[PDB]
Write an enzyme that holds these catalytic residues in place. Structure first.
Site, PDB file in Angstrom:
ATOM      1  N   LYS A 139       0.897  -1.249  -0.098  1.00 28.59           N
ATOM      2  CA  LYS A 139       0.091   0.073   0.050  1.00 28.59           C
ATOM      3  C   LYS A 139       0.829   1.211  -0.046  1.00 28.59           C
TER       4      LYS A 139
ATOM      5  N   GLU B 295       2.484   6.995   6.455  1.00 26.56           N
ATOM      6  CA  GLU B 295       2.150   6.347   7.869  1.00 26.56           C
ATOM      7  C   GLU B 295       2.926   7.205   8.753  1.00 26.56           C
ATOM      8  OE1 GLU B 295       3.000   2.353   7.849  1.00 26.56           O
ATOM      9  OE2 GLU B 295       0.919   1.630   7.569  1.00 26.56           O
TER      10      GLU B 295
ATOM     11  N   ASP C 126      -2.425   7.270   3.966  1.00 26.37           N
ATOM     12  CA  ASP C 126      -2.231   6.015   4.179  1.00 26.37           C
ATOM     13  C   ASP C 126      -2.588   5.429   5.465  1.00 26.37           C
ATOM     14  OD1 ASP C 126      -0.681   3.563   4.656  1.00 26.37           O
ATOM     15  OD2 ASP C 126       1.403   4.364   4.023  1.00 26.37           O
ATOM     16  N   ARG C 127      -3.742   4.816   5.358  1.00 19.69           N
ATOM     17  CA  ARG C 127      -4.926   4.405   6.153  1.00 19.69           C
ATOM     18  C   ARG C 127      -5.751   5.556   6.773  1.00 19.69           C
ATOM     19  NH1 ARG C 127      -3.719  -0.729   7.765  1.00 19.69           N
ATOM     20  NH2 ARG C 127      -1.540  -1.521   7.289  1.00 19.69           N
TER      21      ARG C 127
ATOM     22  N   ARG D  26       8.307  -6.550   3.283  1.00 20.16           N
ATOM     23  CA  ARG D  26       7.691  -5.295   3.697  1.00 20.16           C
ATOM     24  C   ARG D  26       7.649  -5.053   5.207  1.00 20.16           C
TER      25      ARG D  26
ATOM     26  N   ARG E 269       8.176  -3.860   8.712  1.00 17.24           N
ATOM     27  CA  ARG E 269       8.280  -2.613   9.485  1.00 17.24           C
ATOM     28  C   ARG E 269       9.417  -2.932  10.495  1.00 17.24           C
ATOM     29  NH1 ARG E 269       4.667  -1.956   5.977  1.00 17.24           N
ATOM     30  NH2 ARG E 269       3.793   0.088   5.636  1.00 17.24           N
TER      31      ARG E 269
ATOM     32  N   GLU F 245       8.954  -5.345  13.550  1.00 11.38           N
ATOM     33  CA  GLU F 245       7.713  -6.397  13.082  1.00 11.38           C
ATOM     34  C   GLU F 245       8.357  -7.835  13.047  1.00 11.38           C
ATOM     35  OE1 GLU F 245       5.647  -5.000   9.926  1.00 11.38           O
ATOM     36  OE2 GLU F 245       4.669  -6.946   9.570  1.00 11.38           O
TER      37      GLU F 245
END
Ligand SMILES: C#Cc1cn([C@H]2C[C@H](O)[C@@H](CO)O2)c(=O)[nH]c1=O
Ligand SMILES: C#Cc1cn([C@H]2C[C@H](O)[C@@H](CO)O2)c(=O)[nH]c1=O
Lengths: 315, 310
Positions: free
Chosen positions: B18, B39, B113-114, B171, B173, B176
């Site tokens: 995204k 983000e 972004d979101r 992808r 983060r 994560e």
């Protein structure tokens, strides 16, 4: 349209607000005034287990140095989320029924506390108690719902001497006597009163921010920003290298200003007997903003909701 | 007759691409009349708290290993979600006064972004599925979802599970952890979310259909409502407590008036961008409320971008 009068009785715990609210409602006819109590059952059972006990035990363990600031913070934060839930849902479902500001009202709703108690005041006080971060306090602030028309908030006055005595006699389940916290919550609500008055007198916190270096409303002169809630957020966590607030936090203060500024604040003197407080409060209702409702059958709908809430979540 | 705004919130499970997709889209149209609101990674890692994302995955891992309890994980998870959602909540709150009613191409296009429901609904709900958040905390966040402004266009992603796993692997983060169970949980929630909007828009009433959870539009068992048939929310006789039922009334009000669009991510980064562009033809624009709303909104978006985007 038939009109509605909403009155939120708020302030530090242990002043006698809950008693006063009930005495007020007991005067009216059954079907023209309704009581919306503290959602104690939600706090104690439905939302989580013994949340109030959790809150006071957490502060105590922080004080004793048995848990870190960070551990206390995560527990306080999620406990405050639990504390505020019924105030938020209720505000959200009442919202579509409220019309413009506006001769006896068809319905009077007396609330025990406003949403800003759980979404602003206790968080802010816990921050001062070192059990919450100011960032999280500002996250609660940013989630404060839009201030509906006719939001009358009654805050209390009470000498700290009387308050401590009154508190020391009390015994609510989960509570521990904590005068540090009592001082914090009293300071926080005093700042709140001042913040509304400051805002209503045209005060702009961005223009006044430089004056920072560390009551009553709907009366008196414009307060100094250092005597408002804005002063709490001059914290090193919130400040950029250049010494100014990070924009994200300044935006949350802008939200704080927008929410508080349209509120109608009144002060009630609790330094008297329960019937005194009740009659003192009754007189105050004279100068209170009513609103219309959006549908004719909003009044019964609103009535059912209040009674359902009281029945389900009242003690 | 005030100028027009297009708001486009790109959302869905993490690891679909995204944030690449959109950065590319923010290159075509003039740098002036379109802004990419990224983000708030700097808030997540530094400003709001220290390494929130790491905090989140580490907590689920520790619970998974049985090093901490359901309860300990929930208090940690709940606070962290508050941190995650903060920049989304402030931004919406300052933008709201500027939004007029529904509506010549848009004077300004914001691509976020979101949306706020990512941190206020979807992630909490997925973590509930993951055993690390209580369903009452979820409905608390639901209760705080800002009222749905006009022109709230949400783009959700489509991507087959295996292909999504591949992207997630590249992808990740900072902090994560690769979690195929959270991946499935989050994909289901966003799947239920899309279903829920359709259910509501086609006239579905949760109170009316609720009994079907225990005995033309999706079935309620295929909407987000099925998640709240949780025993924590129920009285001894099976009834939902009213306070939770009301939170479900709010959820319905909020989602019904969102405009959802599906973006197939199973294609080249360039193709994703192209698809997102033609998706905009069906999106709802709004007027703004003041003459100076447009450049003020611009400043907000650019400053957010500068201060919080990584
Ligand atoms: C509303 C409210 C709140 C009440 N309280 C306390 C105050 C009293 O000790 C008791 C009942 O009002 O709960 C909080 O600690 N936090 C809140 O948000
Ligand atoms: C928005 C958002 C959120 C993102 N995330 C995660 C998902 C990804 O691993 C990373 C960035 O999207 O943060 C959460 O865990 N919670 C949220 O609320």
């Amino acid at each position: 349209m038939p009109t509605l009068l909403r009155v939120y009785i708020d302030g530090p715990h242990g002043m006698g607000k809950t008693t006063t609210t009930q005495l007020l409602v007991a005067l009216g006819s059954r079907d023209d005034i309704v009581y919306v109590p503290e959602p104690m059952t939600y706090w104690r059972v439905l939302g989580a287990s013994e949340t109030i006990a959790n809150i006071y035990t957490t502060q105590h363990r922080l004080d004793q140095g048995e848990i870190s600031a960070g551990d206390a913070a995560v527990v306080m934060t999620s406990a405050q989320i639990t504390m505020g839930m019924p105030y938020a849902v209720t505000d959200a479902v009442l919202a579509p029924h409220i019309g413009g500001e506006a001769p006896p009202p068809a319905l009077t709703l007396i609330f025990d506390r406003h949403p800003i108690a759980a979404l602003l005041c206790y968080p802010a006080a816990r921050y001062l108690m070192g059990s919450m971060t100011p960032q999280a306090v500002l996250a609660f602030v940013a989630l404060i719902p839009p201030t509906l028309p006719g939001t009358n908030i009654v805050l209390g006055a009470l000498p700290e001497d009387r308050h401590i005595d009154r508190l020391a006699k009390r015994q609510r389940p989960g509570e521990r006597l904590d005068l540090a916290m009592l001082a914090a919550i009293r300071r926080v609500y005093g700042l709140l009163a001042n913040t509304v008055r400051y805002l209503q007198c045209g005060g702009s916190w961005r223009e006044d921010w430089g004056q920072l270096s560390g009551p009553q409303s709907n009366a008196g002169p414009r307060p100094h920003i250092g005597d408002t809630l804005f002063t709490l957020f001059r914290a090193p966590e919130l400040l950029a290298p250049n010494g100014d607030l990070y924009n994200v936090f300044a935006w949350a203060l802008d939200v704080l200003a927008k929410r508080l500024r349209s509120m109608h604040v009144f002060i009630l003197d609790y330094d008297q007997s329960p019937a005194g407080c009740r009659d003192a409060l009754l007189q105050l209702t004279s100068g209170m903003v009513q609103t219309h409702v959006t549908t004719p059958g909003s009044i019964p709908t609103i009535c059912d909701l209040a009674r359902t809430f009281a029945r389900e979540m009242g003690e």
